[PDB]
Amino acid sequence: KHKILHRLLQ
Amino acid sequence: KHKILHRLLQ
Amino acid sequence: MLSDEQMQIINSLVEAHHKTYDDSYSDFVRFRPPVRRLSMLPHLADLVSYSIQKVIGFAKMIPGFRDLTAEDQIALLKSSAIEIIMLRSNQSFSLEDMSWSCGGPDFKYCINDVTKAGHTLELLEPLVKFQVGLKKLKLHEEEHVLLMAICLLSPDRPGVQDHVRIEALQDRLCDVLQAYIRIQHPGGRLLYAKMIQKLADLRSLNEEHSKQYRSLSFQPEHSMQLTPLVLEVFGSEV
Amino acid sequence: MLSDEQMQIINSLVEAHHKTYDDSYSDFVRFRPPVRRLSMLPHLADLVSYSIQKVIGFAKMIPGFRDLTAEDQIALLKSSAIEIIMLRSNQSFSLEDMSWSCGGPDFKYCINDVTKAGHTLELLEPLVKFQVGLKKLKLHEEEHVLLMAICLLSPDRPGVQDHVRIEALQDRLCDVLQAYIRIQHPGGRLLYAKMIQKLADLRSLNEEHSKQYRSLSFQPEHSMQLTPLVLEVFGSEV
Numbered sequence A, B: 001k002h003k004i005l006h007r008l009l010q
Numbered sequence C, D: 001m002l003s004d005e006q007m008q009i010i011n012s013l014v015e016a017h018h019k020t021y022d023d024s025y026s027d028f029v030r031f032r033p034p035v036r037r038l039s040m041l042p043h044l045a046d047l048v049s050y051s052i053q054k055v056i057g058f059a060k061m062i063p064g065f066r067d068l069t070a071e072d073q074i075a076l077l078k079s080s081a082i083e084i085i086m087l088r089s090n091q092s093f094s095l096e097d098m099s100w101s102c103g104g105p106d107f108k109y110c111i112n113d114v115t116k117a118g119h120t121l122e123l124l125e126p127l128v129k130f131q132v133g134l135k136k137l138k139l140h141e142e143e144h145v146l147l148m149a150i151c152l153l154s155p156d157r158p159g160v161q162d163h164v165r166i167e168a169l170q171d172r173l174c175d176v177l178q179a180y181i182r183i184q185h186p187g188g189r190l191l192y193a194k195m196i197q198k199l200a201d202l203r204s205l206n207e208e209h210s211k212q213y214r215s216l217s218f219q220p221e222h223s224m225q226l227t228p229l230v231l232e233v234f235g236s237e238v
């Protein structure tokens, strides 16, 4: 899903 | 998936 | 008096508990250190994760549990984990400071600490009240352990397939405890009822905990602080 | 001499690095303490998880990175994370004891420590060799940082959609470093080549690390010791 990576990349 | 729970329940 | 099979069950639970409950708390030093946004989340996440492993160890020793379908065992653990954990924690709870003491001052938890892990009084108020009322019942190790086995073997949980075989295992346990209180516990004419009521309080606490947990689990900056086991046990990805 | 835009890029990277690389290592006390089956896994898992967060912080400051599709940013981070991490660790590597020193003796890592985290010499031998050869290049902070930006902006990674915009960003960087070595680095006539070669060594290390990691990630007793972020970045669930 990469949800953690998306949040951190915001 | 519960793969961790299955392993521990073995 | 109690029957041999009734007593064998008590001996098995007490031994399963002793084997899964460390009184020295020498494993808390291995957790991410506590820090007093949500500074206590890392430490309390490791505590809960470690406790889940202990509850699983215990469950596997409850007579009759090992013979259920892996699916039911999962359904039971996932739905009762937090209640069993709240029950286990009472052992370290103190009626004086209203806290949990697990070895040193580092591992002394107050309601304030759980607040730093994403929880509100909405949950903590009833939680401390449950701990206090439970602590006041002054349960013998045999009753405390039966209560945890009774709790874990509740057929009325979501996902349970064979709620007839489980309904039975719990009945067997419920009478063992009922017999024990009547034979080995003086002044305990009305204890059993109070205990069953304690199981009802746990449901409310479980409901409230899951609500607040769901809130936290949907925020990736917080979910990432959780451990794989916690995410799997408190997860809905069943 | 260097152009203003060429220098602005160098200033931006050096500042992004300083902002994401803590020389005091005061965050290692917050990791699950090290223990010297796979006793070092918990501690080293937290180290890597923490380093991934730093690499992400850095990446977002590399000029041109923030403007890519979230998908490419992911594809780049996931495929280069471990190499960037190996590059960052060299800062604490010592050619004397052949180890990594991050503050205290608790946080002094030897090849033996990584072994206790599920890795073999199959990986560690080439790893220490890479660290030694890298350390010997005595890179200036500006070259070390460019190398990490160059590495992270490699278009030749799986999952990369627009490998033309990224091919460009990396070209721009590669010449900045090439210009810097020629203008600001005495006795560095053949450094650039050695550096590009170091990027090739990283690929081999990355390949080997992923192999051994996959092995570990398929064993739930070990995967459960990992952190959510690690599982997501080293995972194949792309």
Ligand SMILES: CCC(CC)(c1ccc(OCC(=O)NO)c(C)c1)c1ccc(OC[C@H](O)C(C)(C)C)c(C)c1
Pocket: C021, C041, C044, C045, C047, C048, C050, C051, C052, C054, C085, C086, C087, C088, C089, C092, C100, C101, C102, C109, C113, C114, C117, C119, C209, C213, C216, C230
């Ligand atoms: C710190 C107090 C407490 C009380 C039940 C606790 C659990 C287990 C314990 O150990 C007893 C034992 O036998 N363990 O092996 C001890 C002494 C205390 C708790 C801990 C975490 C909590 O919240 C946790 C969060 O909901 C997460 C999002 C899951 C991190 C909440 C709401 C309460």
Ligand SMILES: CCC(CC)(c1ccc(OCC(=O)NO)c(C)c1)c1ccc(OC[C@H](O)C(C)(C)C)c(C)c1
Pocket: D021, D041, D044, D045, D047, D048, D050, D051, D052, D054, D085, D086, D087, D088, D089, D092, D100, D101, D102, D109, D113, D114, D117, D119, D209, D213, D216, D230
């Ligand atoms: C202990 C040595 C090392 C060398 C690159 C390391 C990483 C990051 C570091 O910090 C530098 C920095 O800037 N961080 O912010 C420091 C000083 C050392 C390492 C660590 C974990 C490893 O293996 C990890 C395993 O593969 C997992 C399964 C993922 C747990 C391997 C193979 C190597």
